[PDB]
């Protein structure tokens, strides 16, 4: 009845209040504590609504929001529950007056379609004609992002990592992107402006010998470097839980004595076999096998972990071999050159594997000064790697950033009037509720919002319908045309389908009946 | 401070609540219950808030912009305390978003002036030399009546009563030029607009009253006619110094602490054959004294001719219990156009209500006079206003162009409750109507009703300052 | 110490809404619940409005003085007032610094006050045609925050021209103030021939020429078949006086007292006007404008000065006979005559031009004028903080808590306009600071633009008794540490 | 916002009296009461203070940082960080300030607060004397508060003595820090030759000539080289003293290898068996035990040792040497003085307390104090101190603020009131009166001749340059950066969401 309408709304209120000033540049960030006890602070909405716990099965449907607009995009989704908000305040304005709730979701599904029309037709194109004005708006388009983190200090030169990581991992033919492609990495340390890019897989290892060759060489013209990943240890085979082998006379002790003994080259020699030089295991080795390695110039690895070794086959084309019975030529990696290189006075020492040829995918490097710095540009340049992968599917482009609100806000509030049906009410608040995205912004800015939008809107009528910026990107000035920030086609459209989508399933429920818990 | 504001509108959109379900003739009736225990119950707005014995003071400002609303246009008492609640209910929704009630009075400055440029543009010029649009438009206002087949008969008699005051050149014009006086008797069919000045009293009913005379003086005389506090002697004194001066027609103020003249100063003013006129009460002494252009006299020594009017012929006609006195033939270059209108009916009861019905038929016409121009009603002004308001709120800059958007929206609860309380649906008519508006501007006009443009402005210009004068009270203090 | 501020702090958040033409007002209700009124003036709301709290009364008793020296700016006198003991909670609490040492503290800060509006005061006394556009910025400054604000660009002249027609002493007994109902505010008109709504007489002819008015006070009532003998020899007494007034050769009298008929009825032989019922403040407008005496001697004539009027005419307006006087002697005097739609409107009109045209009385023998709108109180704020550069320990933070109680001022006045008084006052100080002090706050547009290009000025001597008097005000209210109230009676 | 701001207010009222060599000492109290300990040290009352405010904790992980990087001035940060916190109350309420705003004011102001430092940093390139005494007069500053400040005067020579007797990298591991019971505070000196607090062998003689320092990792007890997997199976006690002979017969052919190295002393990470302790001293080896990471570290740095983890060869290793080995005996424990060693880097302070609680007060007070003489070699520039600096600082705030937005005037100018708060808790401490007294130096630095500023001694406005109070000019510029990005993060955080605990 009537208490359905109302705490559905008033709720929804109040959980999509706490993003509101978490939205822009300049948005507030939180404190979300772990139930471990780690304090986690984040100005996205999509960690936000993820930590939230709560029974309600209205801010639920807010939190499904976000988890399909991550997957598929990742840009928008703290903004698209903010936009969403708004349509549930100006839907309960006209539920007082009886209009009735699919009426609502009628009408707001008809200036969904009639809005995107408006904004079809003053996209632009980018990546047509000279192809290397593409990556001159793209290599800009990074840094509007990167403002509100502390990526913002050196973000000029970090804007040149994900233009560069995009491209070797994409075909101007296939045009695929997958985030699974590249490889999230981050080292605490150092840096941050030592970050560079790589162009195969790059862990961080240690080796168990400090005489060991740092540089694999390619030992008069070989093919390639050959790399052998294998689950069993070259060694004398000991158990891992207990021993207790207790032997009664000097006969079997004078005996395991040289069989054990003899086992220590017949393991080593199998790596001859094959022709390997860097040998990674999930075990480590016994004392002999490094002085062995040593000097054949075979560098081993230890402690490996299993995750990692799936990104090692596939960048060398490698193969995991569960004995060392099953190793061949076929299954041994494939890489151009192996080395260690030494990153400041940092004692990790990693390992840098190139390759020198195009493949199907990279691994990302990304240094840090302290661990909550690693963690921020870590999901910093996540979110970058969202908005080249749109960019480059749709070349048409459009502007945001509160100024494509205020332009498709106003196409609505012209065909209200020539619709002349029931609808026309609902058209009045969809261009409201578009007008909420720029006062939300303004807000966080330190302006009025009331005035910010009546300037948006008095400026784009006696100059041109084309976009005008905002004060709340910190910048000189508007018109962000001239300062090349470019946004997303295919993002924004999804933000507003999926949000408008939202609010009529929840005008579609009537009833909500919410039991114990077993 | 704000929870004086706030106090202050929700008490005052509380009484346009009960406002709404009255407006209309169709409207619903509202119960009063007086602390002397009446029980009343009407229709009219500006009855309730008399009635209402309001506490607040603040809410008591709505009283006086309805008792302004009746004063001037005559008409719309009802629909003006709604459209103050209008812009209260849109004002409460500005301070949550961080606007300052002066903004806000300062707004509605600029959007009250210009929407009185807008209601000329579509209001269309008539013209007081048309008997005929005069007449159609107070007989159809009085569809809102019991009666209404003697309705129309009343028609061209109250429009040709303003025609004396309908010159083109005029700056003040006053219902009081017009005396509208009851009389038991006779029909209402039957009504005689005399030219001169007409009291409610009748003459002298003791033996020797001439009760007419042909030629005779009137004027204001103050003083009393009573024995010294030989007795004849002194009442002779004051009848010898007014036919020296040959005053026919004399006049006393009605005094209720002694008796105003005594019987014995009646019988000597009856050889002299003088007529006397008692019982003058103070709202007719300045009624006289404009279009005789008499002056008040307050002692005897005070009586002279100068002072004195003129009078061609001053009778006393007596239809079926009537005795009225007429007064006619003033010649005088102080006169102005004075009407007096005669209302006779059969029981009490018509003569009141018929004489209150043609009060509300004036001030249509008044409308007219003061501003030119008529306007069909029916919710026509009120759309037309807000629609245009929306367009050219985009072309404003700052906190007013979010102003201009909620007042007007404001002016839909005219066209809106005029819906509710005819039983028609609230969104099928408010969308209908504002659908065919794209075409049709002021399209009712085949239905004979048309609202006077003074209404419409008036409830404007009432509640700009009605509005404003509320939201710049930040506390109400005690003070003795 | 805390009832000492929190009770100056409830006088001066009463009327802290009434200032400036963009303020708010303020209403009030009795226990009748029918005498509530509206009105933003500081001397009826505080007057109303009783106090239990005796040091309250002390702020209001020193703003009735103030209110009849100027007139205008009572309320910034309170409010000002109120900002030097509201930021002493911050000179005590964080600071503790003694009562006395902040009491001198104000009077070292006031001196730099008074010498930045002297060095800052600029006047023109060539083209005197100029300086009546600076009697019209001033007049429309007076005029703000009261119903008078519709028509004061129509009023401007009005009250200008007035002035302008005196030319002599301030004392404003030459000026007249008459409220007529009827007719727009816009209506009124400015008359010099000493308009009078009392009318004399019972025949008397509407015009005369060759008059001569005089001013005597006497009864002519009573003195001190049987009562015939006494009632003509009262008769005969008052005849020789009569005989007297014939002596004078004026063709007009005036008493102050009422006059019996037959020294009445013996006017109208020799042709003298017989003026009755004038009141005590009429005679002392009669003296310094026709140039009468009392009289009080009737033994022998040309004992006294002699007036003149060359046209007594009477007007017929508002219904209500009045009387036009022209062509008489001294005619510098002048009278204002309103016309209000009520009489509720009157009272609020009445008082408003009367402290109007009361400093421009002072602006005759004042010609300094310094500039309004907020841009007063920049200025010496800045003369605040250059004078710190030299300054003891304890009265560095009392002299630097007077600059910041300058710009509460128009804080609080564009809080009442409703705009920004973080973003306006701030980047105000930042023009004036350096060179080229011309702008000010603005309460129309919203920005900061020339008060000068906008006509907005202040008096020289209307601005100093602000800064002064609620300097010394001040002091008072802060150096008692202890009430004691004896037992009611 | 509200439960933020008046909880740091609160956290940071705790240990403002921890502030200034006049300050006072806090007492905390657990439920034992056994527990209780007076100390001045803010980073021991911020982490022992359990705290339920998750704004409070933001400024715990931040003071762990700062105590990283020097030690010192972790309490000037906290306070700095809640006077921000307290004059934004007044900002936003009352002001009508934006919070952002706010924080890009601060961002502007820092700017103005670096480059009055760099004006006002002067140092001396020649005359290395005078440089000297600018390390003595930055010592006294960092061993104020603490009961050290008695003998600070003998203190002074101490510390600035052992940092030029470095000449090198300005890690810590070369200072050894030994704190010995007995004695007066003032017998503490200053010694190179690396004392050790272990001795070496059973019986082994005490001096020891042209000895050569080998570093070494081994296991001595059951050492066996590839011989693992097999285990003593024995249906006797006579039977087990048979097997229990290969212990030995194995070792000496691992002593034979090791005695090829001709060293004269031997170190090891872990203990030692018995016979080859007796065995060494036939050969002339003598063995070192209980040699933990930070022994080895420092070892490393004097005569350059390795790891040596091949035994298999005298050659393909790098071995180090020293002239003379003497072992000492204080404060009954056998000591070892090391001498002659080539290019000796590091050095040793022994101070001697009289009690423990003494001596656990002047470890963090000594080991902070060299830290901070440690940066002033690469940086020389040094500033005037003793609520001087604070107050030049404000003078740069107020210039900028000449040209200034509207909405960013009031948050720049609350930070030059901020910058006078520092100095005025430490009036408060020293039992001065902070208005007068603060009021009468901003008159002198206001225009021109700044050199004087506030004494907490006599009561009256000295010179710091002829009291000898000065401060290091990379001291100061940390202490503004890290307290202006303390208060930026409080600033951003207007709602807190805690998970569900499990």
Same mark, same amino acid.
């Given at each position: 009845?009537?208490?359905?309408?109302?705490?559905?709304?008033?709720?929804?209120?109040?959980?999509?209040?706490?993003?509101?000033?978490?939205?822009?540049?300049?948005?507030?960030?939180?404190?979300?504590?772990?139930?471990?006890?780690?304090?986690?602070?984040?100005?996205?909405?999509?960690?936000?609504?993820?930590?939230?716990?709560?029974?309600?099965?209205?801010?639920?449907?807010?939190? /499904?929001?976000?988890?399909?607009?991550?997957?598929?995009?990742?840009?928008?989704?703290?903004?698209?529950?903010?936009?969403?908000?708004?349509?549930?305040?100006?839907?309960?304005?006209?539920?007082?007056?009886?209009?009735?709730?699919?009426?609502?979701?009628?009408?707001?599904?008809?200036?969904?379609?009639?809005?995107?029309?408006?904004?079809?037709?003053?996209?632009?194109?980018?990546?047509?004609?000279?192809?290397?004005?593409?990556?001159?708006?793209?290599?800009?388009?990074?840094?509007?992002?990167?403002?509100?983190?502390?990526?913002?200090?050196?973000?000029?030169?970090?804007?040149?990592?994900?233009?560069?990581?995009?491209?070797?991992?994409?075909?101007?033919?296939?045009?695929?992107?997958?985030?699974?492609?590249?490889?999230?990495?981050?080292?605490?340390?150092?840096?941050?402006?030592?970050?560079?890019?790589?162009?195969?897989?790059?862990?961080?290892?240690?080796?168990?010998?400090?005489?060991?060759?740092?540089?694999?060489?390619?030992?008069?013209?070989?093919?390639?470097?050959?790399?052998?990943?294998?689950?069993?240890?070259?060694?004398?085979?000991?158990?891992?839980?207990?021993?207790?082998?207790?032997?009664?006379?000097?006969?079997?002790?004078?005996?395991?004595?040289?069989?054990? /003994?003899?086992?220590?080259?017949?393991?080593?020699?199998?790596?001859?076999?094959?022709?390997?030089?860097?040998?990674?295991?999930?075990?480590?080795?016994?004392?002999?096998?490094?002085?062995?390695?040593?000097?054949?110039?075979?560098?081993?690895?230890?402690?490996?972990?299993?995750?990692?070794?799936?990104?090692?086959?596939?960048?060398?084309?490698?193969?995991?071999? #569960?004995?060392?019975?099953?190793?061949?030529?076929?299954?041994?990696?494939?890489?151009?050159?192996?080395?260690?290189?030494?990153?400041?006075?940092?004692?990790?020492?990693?390992?840098?594997?190139?390759?020198?040829?195009?493949?199907?995918?990279?691994?990302?490097?990304?240094?840090?000064?302290?661990?909550?710095?690693?963690?921020?540009?870590?999901?910093?340049?996540?979110?970058?790697?969202?908005?080249?992968?749109?960019?480059?599917?749709?070349?048409?482009?459009?502007?945001?950033?509160?100024?494509?609100?205020?332009?498709?806000?106003?196409?609505?509030?012209?065909?209200?009037?020539?619709?002349?049906?029931?609808?026309?009410?609902?058209?009045?608040?969809?261009?409201?509720?578009?007008?909420?995205? #720029?006062?939300?912004?303004?807000?966080?800015?330190?302006?009025?919002?009331?005035?910010?939008?009546?300037?948006?809107?008095?400026?784009?009528?006696?100059?041109?319908?084309?976009?005008?910026?905002?004060?709340?990107?910190?910048?000189?000035?508007?018109?962000?045309?001239?300062?090349? &920030?470019?946004?997303?086609?295919?993002?924004?459209?999804?933000?507003?389908?999926?949000?408008?989508?939202?609010?009529?399933?929840?005008?579609?429920?009537?009833?909500?009946?919410?039991?114990?818990?077993? | 401070?704000?929870?004086?504001?706030?106090?202050?509108?929700?008490?005052?959109?509380?009484?346009?609540?009960?406002?709404?379900?009255?407006?209309?003739?169709?409207?619903?009736?509202?119960?009063?219950?007086?602390?002397?225990?009446?029980?009343?119950?009407?229709?009219?707005?500006?009855?309730?808030?008399?009635?209402?014995?309001?506490?607040?003071?603040?809410?008591?400002?709505?009283?006086?912009?309805?008792?302004?609303?009746?004063?001037?246009?005559?008409?719309?008492?009802?629909?003006?305390?709604?459209?103050?609640?209008?812009?209260?209910?849109?004002?409460? +929704?500005?301070?949550?978003?961080?606007?300052?009630?002066?903004?806000?009075?300062?707004?509605?400055?600029?959007?009250?002036?210009?929407?009185?440029?807008?209601?000329?543009?579509?209001?269309?010029?008539?013209?007081?030399?048309?008997?005929?649009?005069?007449?159609?438009?107070?007989?159809?206002?009085?569809?809102?009546?019991?009666?209404?087949?003697?309705?129309?008969?009343?028609?061209?008699?109250?429009?040709?009563?303003?025609?004396?005051?309908?010159?083109?050149?005029?700056?003040?014009?006053?219902?009081?030029?017009?005396?509208?006086?009851?009389?038991?008797?006779?029909?209402?069919?039957?009504?005689?607009?005399?030219?001169?000045?007409?009291?409610?009293?009748?003459?002298?009913?003791?033996?020797?009253?001439?009760?007419?005379?042909?030629?005779?003086?009137?004027?204001?005389?103050?003083?009393?006619?009573?024995?010294?506090?030989?007795?004849?002697?002194?009442?002779?004194?004051?009848?010898?110094?007014?036919?020296?001066?040959?005053?026919?027609?004399?006049?006393?103020?009605?005094?209720?602490?002694?008796?105003?003249?005594?019987?014995?100063?009646?019988?000597?003013?009856?050889?002299?054959?003088?007529?006397?006129?008692?019982?003058?009460?103070?709202?007719?002494?300045?009624?006289?004294?404009?279009?005789?252009?008499?002056?008040?006299?307050?002692?005897?020594?005070?009586?002279?001719?100068? +002072?004195?009017?003129?009078?061609?012929?001053?009778?006393?006609?007596?239809? =079926?219990?009537?005795?009225?006195?007429? &007064?006619?033939?003033?010649?005088?270059?102080?006169?102005?156009?004075?009407?007096?209108?005669?209302?006779?009916?059969?029981?009490?009861?018509?003569?009141?209500?018929?004489?209150?019905?043609?009060?509300?038929?004036?001030?249509?016409? +008044?409308?007219?006079?003061?501003?030119?121009?008529?306007?069909?009603?029916?919710?026509?002004?009120?759309?037309?206003?807000?629609?245009?308001?929306?367009?050219?709120?985009?072309?404003?800059?700052?906190?007013?162009?979010?102003?201009?958007?909620?007042? $007007?929206?404001?002016?839909?609860?005219? #066209?809106?409750?005029?819906?509710?309380?005819?039983?028609?649906?609230?969104?099928? &008519?408010?969308?209908?109507?504002?659908?065919?508006?794209?075409?049709?501007?002021?399209?009712?006009?085949?239905?004979?009703?048309?609202?006077?443009?003074?209404?419409?402005?008036?409830?404007?210009?009432? $509640?700009?300052?009605?509005?404003?004068?509320?939201?710049?009270?930040?506390?109400?203090?005690?003070?003795? | 110490?805390?009832?000492?501020?929190?009770?100056?702090?409830?006088?001066?958040?009463?009327?802290?809404?009434?200032?400036? #033409?963009?303020?708010?007002?303020?209403?009030?209700?009795?226990?009748?619940?029918?005498?509530?009124?509206?009105?933003?003036?500081?001397?009826?709301?505080?007057?109303?409005?009783?106090?239990?709290?005796?040091?309250?009364?002390?702020?209001?008793?020193?703003?009735?003085?103030?209110?009849?020296?100027?007139?205008?700016?009572?309320?910034?006198?309170?409010?000002?007032?109120?900002?030097?003991?509201?930021?002493?909670?911050?000179?005590?609490?964080?600071?503790?610094?003694?009562? /006395?040492?902040?009491?001198?503290?104000?009077?070292?800060?006031?001196?730099?006050?008074?010498?930045?509006?002297?060095?800052?005061?600029?006047?023109?006394?060539?083209?005197?045609?100029?300086?009546?556009?600076?009697?019209?910025?001033?007049?429309?400054?007076?005029?703000?925050?009261?119903?008078?604000?519709?028509?004061?660009?129509?009023?401007?002249?009005?009250?200008?021209?007035?002035?302008?027609?005196?030319?002599?002493?301030?004392?404003?007994?030459?000026?007249?103030?008459?409220?007529?109902?009827?007719?727009?505010?816009?209506?009124?008109?400015?008359?010099?021939?000493?308009?009078?709504?009392?009318?004399?007489?019972?025949?008397?002819?509407?015009?005369?020429?060759?008059?001569?008015?005089?001013?005597?006070?006497?009864?002519?009532?009573?003195?001190?078949?049987?009562?015939?003998?006494?009632?003509?020899?009262?008769?005969?007494?008052?005849?020789?006086?009569?005989?007297?007034?014939?002596?004078?050769?004026?063709?007009?009298?005036?008493?102050?007292?009422?006059?019996?008929?037959?020294?009445?009825?013996?006017?109208?032989?020799?042709?003298?006007?017989?003026?009755?019922?004038?009141?005590?403040?009429?005679?002392?407008?009669?003296?310094?404008?026709?140039?009468?005496?009392?009289?009080?001697?009737?033994?022998?004539?040309?004992?006294?000065?002699?007036?003149?009027?060359?046209?007594?005419?009477?007007?017929?307006?508002?219904?209500?006979?009045?009387?036009?006087?022209?062509?008489?002697?001294?005619?510098?005097?002048?009278?204002?005559?309103?016309?209000?739609?009520? =009489?509720?409107?009157?009272?609020?009109?009445?008082?408003?031009?009367?402290?109007?045209?009361?400093?421009?009385?002072?602006?005759?023998?004042?010609?300094?004028?310094?500039?309004?709108?907020?841009?007063?109180?920049?200025?010496?704020?800045?003369?605040?903080?250059?004078?710190?550069?030299?300054? =003891?320990?304890?009265?560095?933070?009392?002299?630097?808590?007077?600059?910041?109680?300058?710009?509460?001022?128009?804080?609080?006045?564009?809080?009442?306009?409703?705009?920004?008084?973080?973003?306006?006052?701030?980047?105000?100080?930042?023009?004036?600071?350096?060179?080229?002090?011309?702008?000010?706050?603005?309460?129309?547009?919203?920005?900061?633009?020339?008060?000068?290009?906008?006509?907005?000025?202040?008096?020289?001597?209307?601005?100093?008794?602000?800064?002064?008097?609620?300097?010394?005000?001040?002091?008072?209210?802060?150096?008692?540490?202890?009430?004691?109230?004896? +037992?009611?009676?």
């Amino acid at each position: 009845g009537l208490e359905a309408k109302k705490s559905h709304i008033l709720a929804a209120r109040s959980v999509a209040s706490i993003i509101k000033t978490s939205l822009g540049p300049r948005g507030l960030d939180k404190i979300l504590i772990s139930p471990d006890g780690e304090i986690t602070i984040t100005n996205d909405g999509a960690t936000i609504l993820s930590q939230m716990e709560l029974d309600n099965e209205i801010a639920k449907l807010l939190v /499904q929001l976000s988890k399909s607009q991550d997957d598929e995009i990742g840009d928008g989704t703290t903004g698209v529950v903010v936009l969403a908000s708004a349509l549930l305040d100006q839907a309960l304005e006209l539920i007082q007056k009886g209009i009735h709730p699919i009426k609502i979701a009628n009408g707001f599904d008809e200036a969904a379609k009639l809005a995107i029309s408006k904004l079809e037709e003053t996209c632009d194109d980018i990546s047509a004609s000279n192809d290397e004005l593409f990556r001159d708006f793209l290599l800009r388009a990074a840094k509007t992002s990167l403002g509100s983190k502390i990526v913002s200090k050196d973000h000029d030169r970090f804007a040149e990592m994900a233009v560069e990581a995009v491209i070797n991992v994409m075909d101007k033919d296939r045009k695929d992107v997958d985030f699974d492609l590249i490889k999230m990495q981050g080292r605490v340390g150092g840096s941050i402006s030592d970050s560079k890019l790589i162009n195969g897989v790059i862990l961080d290892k240690d080796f168990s010998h400090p005489q060991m060759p740092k540089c694999v060489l390619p030992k008069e013209g070989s093919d390639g470097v050959k790399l052998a990943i294998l689950t069993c240890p070259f060694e004398p085979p000991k158990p891992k839980t207990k021993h207790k082998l207790d032997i009664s006379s000097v006969e079997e002790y004078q005996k395991l004595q040289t069989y054990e /003994q003899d086992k220590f080259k017949e393991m080593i020699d199998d790596v001859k076999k094959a022709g390997a030089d860097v040998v990674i295991c999930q075990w480590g080795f016994d004392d002999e096998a490094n002085h062995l390695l040593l000097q054949n110039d075979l560098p081993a690895v230890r402690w490996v972990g299993g995750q990692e070794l799936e990104h090692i086959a596939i960048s060398t084309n490698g193969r995991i071999v #569960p004995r060392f019975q099953d190793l061949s030529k076929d299954k041994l990696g494939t890489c151009s050159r192996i080395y260690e290189q030494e990153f400041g006075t940092t004692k990790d020492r990693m390992l840098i594997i190139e390759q020198s040829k195009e493949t199907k995918t990279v691994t990302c490097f990304v240094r840090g000064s302290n661990k909550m710095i690693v963690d921020e540009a870590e999901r910093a340049l996540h979110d970058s790697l969202c908005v080249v992968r749109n960019l480059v599917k749709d070349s048409r482009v459009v502007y945001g950033g509160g100024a494509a609100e205020v332009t498709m806000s106003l196409a609505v509030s012209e065909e209200a009037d020539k619709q002349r049906g029931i609808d026309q009410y609902a058209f009045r608040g969809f261009a409201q509720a578009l007008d909420t995205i #720029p006062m939300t912004l303004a807000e966080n800015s330190g302006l009025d919002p009331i005035g910010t939008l009546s300037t948006l809107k008095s400026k784009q009528l006696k100059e041109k319908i084309s976009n005008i910026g905002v004060d709340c990107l910190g910048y000189g000035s508007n018109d962000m045309k001239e300062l090349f &920030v470019v946004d997303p086609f295919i993002g924004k459209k999804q933000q507003i389908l999926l949000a408008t989508q939202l609010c009529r399933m929840i005008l579609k429920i009537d009833n909500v009946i919410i039991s114990g818990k077993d | 401070p704000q929870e004086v504001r706030k106090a202050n509108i929700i008490a005052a959109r509380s009484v346009a609540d009960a406002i709404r379900t009255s407006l209309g003739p169709k409207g619903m009736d509202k119960m009063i219950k007086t602390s002397r225990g009446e029980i009343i119950i009407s229709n009219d707005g500006h009855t309730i808030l008399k009635q209402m014995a309001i506490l607040h003071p603040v809410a008591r400002m709505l009283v006086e912009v309805s008792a302004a609303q009746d004063s001037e246009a005559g008409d719309g008492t009802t629909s003006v305390v709604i459209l103050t609640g209008a812009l209260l209910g849109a004002a409460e +929704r500005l301070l949550n978003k961080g606007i300052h009630p002066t903004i806000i009075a300062d707004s509605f400055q600029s959007a009250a002036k210009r929407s009185v440029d807008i209601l000329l543009e579509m209001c269309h010029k008539v013209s007081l030399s048309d008997r005929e649009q005069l007449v159609r438009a107070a007989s159809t206002s009085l569809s809102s009546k019991i009666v209404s087949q003697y309705s129309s008969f009343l028609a061209p008699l109250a429009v040709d009563s303003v025609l004396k005051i309908s010159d083109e050149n005029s700056k003040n014009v006053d219902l009081n030029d017009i005396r509208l006086v009851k009389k038991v008797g006779g029909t209402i069919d039957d009504t005689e607009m005399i030219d001169g000045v007409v009291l409610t009293q009748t003459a002298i009913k003791s033996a020797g009253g001439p009760t007419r005379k042909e030629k005779a003086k009137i004027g204001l005389i103050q003083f009393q006619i009573s024995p010294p506090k030989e007795e004849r002697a002194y009442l002779l004194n004051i009848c010898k110094k007014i036919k020296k001066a040959k005053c026919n027609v004399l006049l006393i103020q009605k005094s209720i602490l002694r008796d105003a003249v005594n019987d014995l100063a009646l019988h000597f003013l009856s050889k002299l054959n003088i007529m006397v006129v008692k019982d003058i009460e103070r709202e007719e002494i300045e009624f006289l004294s404009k279009g005789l252009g008499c002056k008040p006299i307050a002692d005897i020594e005070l009586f002279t001719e100068d +002072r004195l009017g003129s009078a061609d012929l001053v009778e006393e006609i007596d239809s =079926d219990g009537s005795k009225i006195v007429r &007064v006619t033939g003033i010649r005088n270059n102080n006169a102005r156009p004075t009407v007096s209108v005669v209302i006779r009916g059969a029981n009490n009861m018509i003569i009141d209500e018929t004489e209150r019905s043609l009060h509300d038929a004036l001030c249509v016409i +008044r409308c007219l006079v003061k501003e030119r121009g008529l306007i069909a009603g029916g919710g026509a002004p009120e759309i037309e206003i807000s629609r245009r308001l929306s367009k050219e709120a985009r072309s404003m800059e700052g906190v007013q162009a979010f102003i201009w958007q909620e007042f $007007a929206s404001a002016l839909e609860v005219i #066209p809106t409750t005029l819906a509710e309380n005819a039983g028609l649906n609230s969104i099928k &008519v408010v969308t209908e109507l504002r659908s065919k508006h794209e075409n049709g501007e002021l399209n009712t006009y085949e239905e004979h009703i048309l609202q006077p443009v003074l209404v419409s402005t008036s409830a404007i210009t009432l $509640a700009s300052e009605c509005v404003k004068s509320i939201l710049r009270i930040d506390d109400i203090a005690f003070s003795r | 110490r805390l009832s000492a501020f929190v009770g100056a702090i409830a006088v001066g958040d009463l009327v802290k809404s009434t200032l400036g #033409p963009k303020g708010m007002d303020k209403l009030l209700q009795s226990a009748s619940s029918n005498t509530c009124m509206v009105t933003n003036d500081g001397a009826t709301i505080l007057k109303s409005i009783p106090l239990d709290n005796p040091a309250a009364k002390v702020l209001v008793n020193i703003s009735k003085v103030q209110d009849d020296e100027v007139g205008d700016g009572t309320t910034s006198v309170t409010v000002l007032s109120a900002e030097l003991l509201r930021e002493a909670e911050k000179l005590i609490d964080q600071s503790k610094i003694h009562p /006395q040492t902040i009491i001198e503290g104000y009077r070292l800060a006031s001196a730099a006050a008074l010498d930045a509006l002297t060095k800052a005061a600029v006047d023109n006394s060539h083209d005197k045609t100029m300086f009546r556009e600076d009697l019209i910025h001033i007049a429309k400054t007076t005029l703000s925050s009261k119903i008078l604000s519709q028509d004061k660009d129509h009023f401007a002249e009005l009250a200008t021209n007035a002035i302008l027609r005196l030319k002599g002493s301030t004392n404003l007994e030459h000026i007249q103030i008459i409220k007529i109902l009827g007719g727009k505010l816009s209506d009124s008109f400015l008359d010099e021939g000493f308009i009078l709504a009392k009318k004399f007489g019972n025949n008397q002819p509407k015009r005369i020429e060759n008059a001569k008015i005089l001013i005597a006070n006497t009864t002519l009532d009573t003195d001190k078949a049987k009562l015939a003998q006494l009632e003509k020899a009262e008769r005969e007494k008052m005849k020789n006086k009569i005989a007297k007034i014939s002596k004078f050769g004026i063709n007009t009298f005036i008493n102050r007292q009422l006059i019996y008929d037959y020294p009445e009825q013996l006017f109208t032989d020799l042709g003298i006007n017989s003026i009755e019922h004038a009141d005590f403040e009429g005679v002392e407008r009669l003296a310094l404008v026709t140039g009468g005496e009392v009289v009080s001697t009737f033994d022998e004539p040309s004992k006294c000065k002699l007036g003149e009027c060359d046209v007594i005419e009477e007007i017929m307006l508002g219904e209500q006979p009045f009387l036009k006087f022209s062509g008489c002697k001294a005619g510098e005097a002048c009278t204002i005559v309103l016309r209000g739609a009520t =009489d509720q409107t009157l009272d609020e009109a009445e008082r408003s031009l009367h402290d109007a045209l009361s400093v421009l009385s002072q602006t005759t023998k004042e010609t300094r004028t310094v500039l309004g709108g907020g841009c007063a109180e920049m200025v010496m704020s800045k003369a605040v903080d250059t004078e710190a550069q030299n300054i =003891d320990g304890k009265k560095s933070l009392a002299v630097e808590a007077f600059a910041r109680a300058l710009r509460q001022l128009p804080t609080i006045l564009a809080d009442n306009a409703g705009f920004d008084s973080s973003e306006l006052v701030s980047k105000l100080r930042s023009s004036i600071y350096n060179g080229i002090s011309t702008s000010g706050l603005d309460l129309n547009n919203g920005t900061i633009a020339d008060m000068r290009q906008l006509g907005i000025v202040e008096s020289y001597k209307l601005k100093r008794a602000v800064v002064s008097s609620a300097s010394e005000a001040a002091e008072v209210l802060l150096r008692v540490d202890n009430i004691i109230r004896a +037992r009611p009676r």
